[PDB]
Every structure is written in structure tokens, then in C-alpha cells.
Motif scaffolding. Structure first.
Motif, PDB file in Angstrom:
ATOM      1  N   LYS A  84       0.833  -1.186   0.000  1.00 49.19           N
ATOM      2  CA  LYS A  84       0.000   0.000   0.000  1.00 49.19           C
ATOM      3  C   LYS A  84       0.875   1.246   0.000  1.00 49.19           C
ATOM      4  N   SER A  85       0.797   2.006  -1.086  1.00 47.81           N
ATOM      5  CA  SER A  85       1.524   3.260  -1.182  1.00 47.81           C
ATOM      6  C   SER A  85       0.782   4.342  -0.410  1.00 47.81           C
ATOM      7  N   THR A  86       1.423   4.850   0.631  1.00 46.92           N
ATOM      8  CA  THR A  86       0.823   5.862   1.471  1.00 46.92           C
ATOM      9  C   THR A  86       1.924   6.489   2.308  1.00 46.92           C
ATOM     10  N   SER A  87       1.876   7.805   2.471  1.00 47.59           N
ATOM     11  CA  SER A  87       2.911   8.522   3.226  1.00 47.59           C
ATOM     12  C   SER A  87       2.671   8.397   4.721  1.00 47.59           C
ATOM     13  N   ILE A  88       3.673   7.904   5.445  1.00 49.21           N
ATOM     14  CA  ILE A  88       3.600   7.777   6.898  1.00 49.21           C
ATOM     15  C   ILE A  88       4.759   8.547   7.523  1.00 49.21           C
ATOM     16  N   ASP A  89       4.466   9.726   8.054  1.00 45.50           N
ATOM     17  CA  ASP A  89       5.469  10.552   8.729  1.00 45.50           C
ATOM     18  C   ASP A  89       5.757   9.941  10.097  1.00 45.50           C
ATOM     19  N   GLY A  90       7.021   9.779  10.462  1.00 43.29           N
ATOM     20  CA  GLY A  90       7.349   9.271  11.775  1.00 43.29           C
ATOM     21  C   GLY A  90       8.798   9.511  12.125  1.00 43.29           C
ATOM     22  N   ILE A  91       9.196   9.086  13.320  1.00 42.40           N
ATOM     23  CA  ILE A  91      10.554   9.300  13.795  1.00 42.40           C
ATOM     24  C   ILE A  91      11.307   7.985  13.949  1.00 42.40           C
ATOM     25  N   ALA A  92      12.588   8.030  13.632  1.00 43.00           N
ATOM     26  CA  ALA A  92      13.473   6.909  13.882  1.00 43.00           C
ATOM     27  C   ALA A  92      13.979   7.037  15.307  1.00 43.00           C
ATOM     28  N   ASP A  93      13.529   6.122  16.170  1.00 49.15           N
ATOM     29  CA  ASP A  93      13.723   6.272  17.619  1.00 49.15           C
ATOM     30  C   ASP A  93      14.242   4.984  18.271  1.00 49.15           C
ATOM     31  N   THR A  94      15.554   4.922  18.451  1.00 43.91           N
ATOM     32  CA  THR A  94      16.176   3.751  19.064  1.00 43.91           C
ATOM     33  C   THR A  94      15.786   3.559  20.524  1.00 43.91           C
ATOM     34  N   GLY A  95      15.288   4.610  21.163  1.00 44.57           N
ATOM     35  CA  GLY A  95      14.885   4.532  22.552  1.00 44.57           C
ATOM     36  C   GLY A  95      13.449   4.116  22.803  1.00 44.57           C
ATOM     37  N   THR A  96      12.715   3.794  21.744  1.00 41.33           N
ATOM     38  CA  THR A  96      11.365   3.246  21.859  1.00 41.33           C
ATOM     39  C   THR A  96      11.399   1.798  21.409  1.00 41.33           C
ATOM     40  N   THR A  97      10.785   0.917  22.188  1.00 42.11           N
ATOM     41  CA  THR A  97      10.859  -0.515  21.927  1.00 42.11           C
ATOM     42  C   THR A  97      10.090  -0.923  20.670  1.00 42.11           C
ATOM     43  N   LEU A  98       8.864  -0.431  20.567  1.00 45.87           N
ATOM     44  CA  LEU A  98       7.906  -0.926  19.578  1.00 45.87           C
ATOM     45  C   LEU A  98       7.738  -0.023  18.352  1.00 45.87           C
ATOM     46  N   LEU A  99       6.958  -0.516  17.400  1.00 46.04           N
ATOM     47  CA  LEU A  99       6.605   0.210  16.186  1.00 46.04           C
ATOM     48  C   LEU A  99       5.196   0.767  16.361  1.00 46.04           C
ATOM     49  N   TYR A 100       5.072   2.096  16.371  1.00 50.61           N
ATOM     50  CA  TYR A 100       3.787   2.768  16.591  1.00 50.61           C
ATOM     51  C   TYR A 100       3.367   3.452  15.297  1.00 50.61           C
ATOM     52  N   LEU A 101       2.231   3.029  14.752  1.00 55.96           N
ATOM     53  CA  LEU A 101       1.786   3.496  13.447  1.00 55.96           C
ATOM     54  C   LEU A 101       0.297   3.859  13.488  1.00 55.96           C
ATOM     55  N   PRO A 102      -0.220   4.504  12.435  1.00 47.39           N
ATOM     56  CA  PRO A 102      -1.633   4.905  12.466  1.00 47.39           C
ATOM     57  C   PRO A 102      -2.565   3.722  12.674  1.00 47.39           C
TER      58      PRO A 102
END
Length: 330
Positions: free
Chosen positions: A210-228
Motif C-alpha cells: 500500500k503506497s501511502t505517506s507515513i510521517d514518523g521518527i526513527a527512535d532507538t529509545g522506543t521498543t515498539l513500532l507505533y503506526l496509524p
């Protein structure tokens, strides 16, 4: 100059990673959580409220011949998980993997919240987001990377996190033996102080992309993947019996499940997170309900490409005048 240090999971779930850091003279080695989502280098110390220390190694500035109080400076930080710490500040010599910065701001904790006290394996944090997020007042301080940058062979650092295994943080060079194929670079916005980028989309398992823009941060200090919530619902819909539990605090799934992979886009490239990386085990000891590694960002206010995503890639944090992020498979 360059540095290279091994980073090691703190537990069997890869809840976080610790990297040894040398502080002071003679060196005091503390195991810090390198965090590309914050910009303070803070440590448990001889100043930390005694009841709030439980097994951590502490920095004792009075035993360092190179430590100097940064007079009048204080700091106070709150993280996305609700944890917090605060204290005063020293400057001292800090070395990571052979790379040395003199005059680094070392933020000495007077107080830490319970989650820090309860984690005996983490002696503090080393922030690697942009220095504009640093909390020292009244004079904001630079991150270790910002201080090191001019001396580095190249103004970069890389994160190569392991799945249930050690990995590596490198400073000042790209290890071309540490990844497969090519590195795809993508634009970064520093407007919020983070390594913020836009993924080009996703796939669930062997499903279509699915082509769709997902703005987010690259965060080594967060354990999980948080998405819409839309994306996360589409993922968990492919796991029989998975559901969002308000009582537990997110998506859970039957521990008997085989989880599908999750793919995210970086430009025209694709990073595949194996299903096993998304398993965070029983919600409580002995439970047959397991916690998911992909969760909704709704109510965080930002999408977070945390360790679940980053450990599937070799990741370049390019701190050139125009910063960018690079991702390769490995």
C-alpha cells in the motif's frame, strides 16, 4: 576520528539496548541507552536520591579529575512513556567505542522516576536526536554526536540493532560489510528536533504493498513500532484471535499464533520486519495472551519507528548540513 561500540539487549525481549560509555578520568564505565528520540546524556550518579537507586552503576563526579560543575545548570526531562528524571550538570570527558569528546555535558540525576529505578540494567541515557531538544537550562547543551561531529571522518552515526542478539553503534563511518544491497536515503525534517522522515507505505505478510505517506521518527529509545490505527488494524486483522485490549494497553494475540511479517517503504526500497520480531511474549508470566510489537500511535501524536522496525535494518543517521536517514537490509 571514528568510534565503534557494541550494543546489547537488556533482556530476552529486546526491550532496550545498552552500550558501554566511559565517563571521566579515570574512566567510569556506565551502560547507557542510546536514544535517537531525545537529546540529553544523563546518568545515575552519586547525587541520585538513594531510595531511587537499585542496582545501577553510578557516576561519581568527585572521583573524576576532569569533571567540572556546570554552575547553575539544571535539567528535567519527561519521556513519551511517562518516565522522567532531573538534576544538575557537569562537564567531563566522554568516550564511546574509542571516540572521545572533551567538555561533554553529563547530566547528573538527582531524581529518577520509578521505571528507571526498577530497571537495574540501564545506568542512564545518551541522546542522539537534535540538540534543540536538550533540556539543560539556562544554557542548552549539545549532544555527544553534535560535539563529536567536526572531528569525525564523516558526520554520521549508524545503528545496527540485533534481534535477540548484540549489535553495533558506529560513529564517523559506514561499515559497508554490515548490510546487504544498497542504502536508500530519505529526507529528514528537524522541525520537531527528531530524526523525522516519511515512509512510502507498507505491506502485511505476503500482501500487496500500500503506497501511502507515513510521517514518523526513527527512535532507538522506543521498543515498539507505533503506526496509524488504520495500518495497525490491517496488520492484526491477519492474526486469528488478535484484538486490542484496553485493559492490557494495546493489541494482544494468542501466543499460539504465527505472526506475519510487516514491510515498510523507504523511497522505492522495502524493509521487511519478520513476524518473530513482532512477538513480545506473554502479557504476564504464564499467560497465553501475547503482546504485539506493532501498536497504534493514536494519542501519541506521532508515529514512531522504534526498535522493532530499526532492528530489521542497517540505519544511517546522516548529520550533514542537510540531514538525511539511510536504510539498508542486512
Amino acid at each position: 576520528s571514528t568510534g565503534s561500540a557494541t550494543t546489547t539487549p537488556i533482556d530476552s525481549l529486546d526491550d532496550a539496548y545498552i552500550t558501554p560509555v566511559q565517563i571521566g578520568t579515570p574512566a567510569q564505565t556506565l551502560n547507557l541507552d542510546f536514544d535517537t528520540g531525545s537529546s540529553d546524556l544523563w546518568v545515575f550518579s552519586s547525587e541520585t536520591t538513594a531510595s531511587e537507586v537499585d542496582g545501577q552503576t553510578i557516576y561519581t563526579p568527585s572521583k573524576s579529575t576532569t569533571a567540572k560543575l556546570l554552575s547553575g545548570a539544571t535539567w528535567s526531562i519527561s519521556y513519551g512513556d511517562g518516565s522522567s528524571s532531573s538534576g544538575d550538570v557537569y562537564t567531563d570527558t566522554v568516550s564511546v567505542g574509542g571516540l572521545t569528546v572533551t567538555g561533554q555535558a553529563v547530566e547528573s540525576a538527582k531524581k529518577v522516576s520509578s521505571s528507571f529505578t526498577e530497571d537495574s540494567t540501564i545506568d542512564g541515557l545518551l541522546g542522539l536526536a537534535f540538540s534543540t531538544l536538550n533540556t539543560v537550562s539556562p544554557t542548552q547543551q549539545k549532544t555527544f554526536f553534535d560535539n563529536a561531529k567536526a572531528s569525525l571522518d564523516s558526520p554520521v552515526f549508524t545503528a545496527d540493532l540485533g534481534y535477540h542478539a548484540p549489535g553495533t553503534y558506529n560513529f564517523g563511518f559506514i561499515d559497508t560489510t554490515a548490510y546487504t544491497g544498497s542504502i536508500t536515503y530519505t529526507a529528514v525534517s528537524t522541525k520537531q528536533g527528531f530524526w523525522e522522515w516519511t515512509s512510502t507505505g507498507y505491506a502485511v505478510g505476503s500482501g500487496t504493498f500500500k503506497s501511502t505517506s507515513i510521517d514518523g521518527i526513527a527512535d532507538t529509545g522506543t521498543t515498539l513500532l507505533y503506526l496509524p490505527a488504520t495500518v495497525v488494524s490491517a496488520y492484526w486483522a491477519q492474526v486469528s484471535g488478535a484484538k486490542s485490549s484496553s485493559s492490557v494497553g494495546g493489541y494482544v494475540f494468542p501466543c499460539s499464533a504465527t505472526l506475519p511479517s510487516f514491510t515498510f517503504g523507504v523511497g522505492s526500497a522495502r524493509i521487511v520486519i519478520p513476524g518473530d520480531y513482532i512477538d513480545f511474549g506473554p502479557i504476564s508470566t504464564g499467560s497465553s495472551s501475547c503482546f504485539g510489537g506493532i501498536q497504534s500511535s493514536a494519542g501519541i501524536g506521532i508515529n514512531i519507528f522504534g526498535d522493532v522496525a530499526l532492528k530489521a535494518a542497517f540505519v544511517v543517521f546522516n548529520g550533514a548540513t542537510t540531514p538525511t536517514l539511510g536504510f539498508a537490509s542486512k
